[PDB]
Design a protein around this ligand. Structure first.
Ligand SMILES: *[C@@H]1O[C@H](CO)[C@@H](O)[C@H](O)[C@H]1NC(C)=O
Ligand SMILES: *[C@@H]1O[C@H](CO)[C@@H](O)[C@H](O)[C@H]1NC(C)=O
Length: 188
């Protein structure tokens, strides 16, 4: 039963300083065939080395670099072993609609996509009087689909009096928040 010690959980705050992840194989009854690093379940490029003490350097760390990292140890004649290091960052919203123009009675569809771990929670707001406030569904016309890295707001039966304006999506996790906005224009 092999033993692996790791460096501590990493919280990314900005992109200046590199961050280094470490795993040390501290006990083994089997010869090491090789060890590598994975990120979010996928092997990282050129990390396969035959070293008990592994390091992974993240240069210019960003939200894209966050996730669950594993140092994996493949043994000759024995099952693999791994340990986990979490690298956390504030969300980054990577996709949205800048604007949407629809007709009265049609449906509006707005969305946002994020990168960052832990996956964010999402909220939609509308800008009124310079302040982004919570969206009322008193009308029953607002539908929100929230996934881990994606949110979607649908507004059915568009009304030109009430619906136009600036809508923003806010992605929040324990590290921080990000938001972007979409302008909705209703016509006809
Ligand atoms: C890994 O082992 C080397 C000792 O050569 C040391 O620099 C480092 O502190 C160790 N890392 C951890 C997480 O124990
Ligand atoms: C808005 O109200 C309708 C009817 O209760 C419901 O289908 C829908 O899920 C609500 N939207 C949200 C964001 O809760």
């Amino acid at each position: 039963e092999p033993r692996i010690v790791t460096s501590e959980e990493v919280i990314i705050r900005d992109s200046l300083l590199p961050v280094t992840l470490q795993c040390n194989l501290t006990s083994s009854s089997h010869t090491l065939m090789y060890s590598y690093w994975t990120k979010n379940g996928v092997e990282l490029t050129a990390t396969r080395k035959n070293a008990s003490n592994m390091e992974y350097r993240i240069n210019k760390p960003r939200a894209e670099d966050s996730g669950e990292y594993h140092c994996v140890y493949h043994f000759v004649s024995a099952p693999k072993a791994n340990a986990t290091i979490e690298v956390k960052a504030a969300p980054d919203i990577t996709g949205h609609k800048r604007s949407e123009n629809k007709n009265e009675g049609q449906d509006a569809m707005m969305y946002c996509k994020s990168v960052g771990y832990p996956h964010p929670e999402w909220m939609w707001r509308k800008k009124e009087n310079g302040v982004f406030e919570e969206i009322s569904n008193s009308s029953g016309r607002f539908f929100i689909i929230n996934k881990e890295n994606y949110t979607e707001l649908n507004i059915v039966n568009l009304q030109i009096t009430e619906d136009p304006g600036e809508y923003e999506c806010n992605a929040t996790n324990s590290i921080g928040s990000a938001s972007v906005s979409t302008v909705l224009r209703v016509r006809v």
